[PDB]
Amino acid sequence: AFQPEFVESISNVSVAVGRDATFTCHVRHLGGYRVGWLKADTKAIQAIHENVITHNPRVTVSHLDQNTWNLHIKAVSEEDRGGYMCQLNTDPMKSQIGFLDVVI
Amino acid sequence: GSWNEPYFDLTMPRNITSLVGKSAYLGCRVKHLGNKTVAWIRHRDLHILTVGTYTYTTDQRFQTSYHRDIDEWTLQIKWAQQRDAGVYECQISTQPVRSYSVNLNIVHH
Ligand SMILES: *[C@@H]1O[C@H](CO[C@@H]2O[C@@H](C)[C@@H](O)[C@@H](O)[C@@H]2O)[C@@H](O[C@@H]2O[C@H](CO)[C@@H](O[C@@H]3O[C@H](CO)[C@@H](O)[C@H](O[C@H]4O[C@H](CO)[C@@H](O)[C@H](O)[C@@H]4O)[C@@H]3O)[C@H](O)[C@H]2NC(C)=O)[C@H](O[C@@H]2O[C@@H](C)[C@@H](O)[C@@H](O)[C@@H]2O)[C@H]1NC(C)=O
Ligand SMILES: *[C@@H]1O[C@H](CO[C@@H]2O[C@@H](C)[C@@H](O)[C@@H](O)[C@@H]2O)[C@@H](O[C@@H]2O[C@H](CO)[C@@H](O[C@@H]3O[C@H](CO)[C@@H](O)[C@H](O[C@H]4O[C@H](CO)[C@@H](O)[C@H](O)[C@@H]4O)[C@@H]3O)[C@H](O)[C@H]2NC(C)=O)[C@H](O[C@@H]2O[C@@H](C)[C@@H](O)[C@@H](O)[C@@H]2O)[C@H]1NC(C)=O
Ligand SMILES: *[C@@H]1O[C@H](CO[C@@H]2O[C@@H](C)[C@@H](O)[C@@H](O)[C@@H]2O)[C@@H](O[C@@H]2O[C@H](CO)[C@@H](O)[C@H](O)[C@H]2NC(C)=O)[C@H](O[C@@H]2O[C@@H](C)[C@@H](O)[C@@H](O)[C@@H]2O)[C@H]1NC(C)=O
C-alpha cells in the first residue's frame, strides 16, 4: 500500500482582517489522488485539485509540487474564521483540519 | 427570464429509507443553477462524494446523475450498506453556500 499520507499537520493561521491567508496541506505519495478543501463549520466545498468550487471570489488554490497543496484566502474577513479541512479521496478518506484566526 | 440565484425544490424528501444491498437514491432538485455546481457530501466525515456528475470519492459505489427534465441531481449509493446510513447534503456553490440535507436509513426489511 503506497497510499497517500499526510506529512505533517496543517499549520494554523492567525491573520489580521484584510490581509491574505494560506493553508498548506503537506502530503507524500499523492499519486493520482486529489486534494479537496472544505470549510468545516459551513461544510462548504472550497476546491478540488486545481479547480476552485466555491464562488467566493477571494478563494484560490495552488500547488508548489505534488507534495504541497495550498488554499488561499484573500483579504480575510471575520466570516472566514473557523476550520479548513484538507481531504484526500483515498478509501477510506483521510483528512486534517487547520484553523483560521482573524484578529482585528 | 431575469438571472436568478439557484434554489432548491423544498418538497423533495428529506428522510429516505432503502434496502441493504440495493441502490439508494438521494434526490436534489436545483432551479436556476446557472454557473454554479451541485455537490453531494457525507455529513459524518465531511467526505466530498460528487461535484456535478464528477465523482471525487474512490468508493466506486457513489455516482451522481443529472436528470435535465426535472432539474434533479440524484446521488446513487450502489449496494448500500448499514454503515452508509446517516445524513448527506446537496450543496450549491453559492457564497454563502446553499444546502439541502437528506437523512438516509438503510434497513434489511
Ligand atoms: C491547530 O489548532 C488546533 C486547536 O485549535 C483550537 O481549537 C479549535 C477547536 C478552534 O477553536 C481553534 O480556533 C483553536 O485555536 C490543534 O488541535 C488541538 O491540539 C491539542 C493538543 O495540543 C488537543 O488538546 C487535547 O484535547 C483533548 C480533548 O479535546 C485532551 O484529552 C488532550 O489532553 C491529553 O493530552 C495532552 C497532551 O496533548 C495532555 O497534556 C493532557 O494532560 C491529556 O493527557 C489534549 O489537551 C486539542 O483537542 C486539539 N483540537 C482539535 C480541534 O483537534 C492543532 O494541533 C494539532 O492537532 C492535534 C490533534 C495534535 O495532533 C497536535 O499535535 C497537532 O499539532 C493545531 N495545529 C498545529 C499544527 O499546531
Ligand atoms: C459564472 O461563473 C464563471 C466562473 O467563475 C469562476 O469559477 C467558479 C468555479 C468560482 O471559482 C468563481 O468564483 C470564479 O470567478 C464566471 O466566469 C469567471 O468570472 C471571473 C470574474 O468574476 C473571471 O475571473 C477574473 O478574470 C480576470 C481576467 O479575465 C482577472 O483579472 C480576475 O482577477 C481579479 O479578480 C478577482 C475577483 O474574481 C480578484 O479576487 C483578484 O484579486 C483579481 O483582482 C479574475 O481572475 C474568470 O476568468 C471567469 N472564468 C472564465 C472561465 O472565464 C462567470 O462570470 C461571467 O463571465 C466572466 C468572463 C466575467 O465577464 C464575469 O464578469 C461574468 O459575470 C459567471 N457568470 C455570471 C453570469 O455570473
Ligand atoms: C425518518 O425515517 C425513519 C425510518 O423510516 C421511516 O419508517 C417507515 C416506517 C416509514 O414511515 C418510512 O416512510 C420512514 O422513512 C424513522 O425512524 C423509525 O421510526 C420508527 C417509528 O416511527 C421506528 O420503529 C424505527 O425503528 C425507526 N427506524 C430507524 C432506522 O431509526 C424516523 O423517525 C424518527 O426516529 C425514530 C427513531 C423515532 O424516534 C421517531 O419518533 C422519529 O420521528 C424518521 N425521522 C423523522 C424526523 O421523521
Numbering used by the authors:
A (entry chain B): 39 to 142
B (entry chain A): 48 to 156
Paste lines from the article:
We have recently identified interactions between two groups of Drosophila IgSF (immunoglobulin superfamily) cell adhesion molecules with properties closely matching a neuronal chemoaffinity function: 21 Dpr proteins, named after the founding member Defective proboscis extension response, selectively bind nine proteins, now called the Dpr-interacting proteins, or DIPs. All 21 Dprs and nine DIPs are predicted to contain two and three immunoglobulin (IG) domains, respectively. Our previous work identified the first IG domains, termed IG1, as the domains mediating the Dpr–DIP interaction by the formation of a pseudo-symmetric IG1-IG1 heterocomplex using the GFCC’C’ face of the immunoglobulin fold. Therefore, Dprs and DIPs are strong candidates for a synapse specification or targeting function.
